């Protein structure tokens, strides 16, 4: 086509979606990870994760307001990944990299799994 | 912080949100523009437009599944702007620039209004 493009548009959209999350505006699901609860937007979860994409395209699960993750999933690993989904920023540290990689493999977040594998290979 | 960043993350998120829109997945509102109807995600509309942000943060309007725009709004201008919201791409043409600018001013999409003003000033 003959379209023009606004370079910062996608980043600005994601920044506003994170502002809505921080104010709990139009969040439509709670993700339960052990004792911890995380509110989010189903569309953002689907856009970032192969697991949530499969869950919320399911004709029955698409209507659930509560999703319980596998008890092996670490709440801190999930929190770091949820922050990444809404910001593009990953808080990857020596003390959390194993839990982050395991959570990203479960959530099917291919690019995160790739950087964790590379950071582990280096050490 | 000591975060790493995935450059293409925001663009990939927006691409997936547009894929959900094209398949009518988790759309939660219909925007009525004269005789024309446009399905969308309230969160994406809020993230892109000062008008939708104000509408869906309203304690009563946040629950509406149908929003009717001012009858002066042109459906083609709205369609071009809705496509921009989900892609960062604006189909700005000599034949649509006046309707696009008027719709962007109504929707409170500051960056679109700015490029329309610049393109009009050049001609």
């Amino acid at each position: 086509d003959s379209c023009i493009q606004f370079t910062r548009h996608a980043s600005d959209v994601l920044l506003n979606l994170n502002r809505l999350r921080s104010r709990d505006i139009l969040t439509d699901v709670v993700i339960v990870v052990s004792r911890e609860q995380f509110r989010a937007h189903k569309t953002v979860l689907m856009a970032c994760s192969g697991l949530f994409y499969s869950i919320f395209t399911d004709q029955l699960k698409c209507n659930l307001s509560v999703i319980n993750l596998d008890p092996e999933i670490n709440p801190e690993g999930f929190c770091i990944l949820l922050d990444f989904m809404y910001t593009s920023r990953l808080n990857l540290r020596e003390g959390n990299i194993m839990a982050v990689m395991a959570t990203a493999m479960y959530l099917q977040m291919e690019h995160v799994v790739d950087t964790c594998r590379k950071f582990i290979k280096a050490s | 912080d000591s975060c790493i960043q995935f450059t293409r993350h925001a663009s990939d998120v927006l691409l997936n949100l547009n894929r959900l829109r094209s398949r009518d997945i988790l759309t939660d509102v219909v925007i009525v523009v004269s005789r024309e109807q446009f399905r969308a995600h309230k969160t994406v509309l809020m993230a892109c437009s000062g008008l939708f942000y104000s509408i869906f943060t309203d304690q009563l309007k946040c629950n509406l599944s149908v929003i009717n725009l001012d009858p002066e709004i042109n459906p083609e201008g709205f369609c071009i702007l809705l496509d921009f919201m989900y892609t960062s791409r604006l189909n700005l043409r000599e034949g649509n620039i006046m309707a696009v600018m008027a719709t962007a001013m109504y929707l409170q999409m500051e960056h679109v209004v700015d490029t329309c003003r610049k393109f009009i000033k050049a001609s």
């Binding site: 379209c3 023009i4 493009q5 | 960056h111 490029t115």
Partner: peptide
């Protein structure tokens, strides 16, 4: 704004 750019030409994509």
């Amino acid at each position: 704004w750019v030409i994509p």
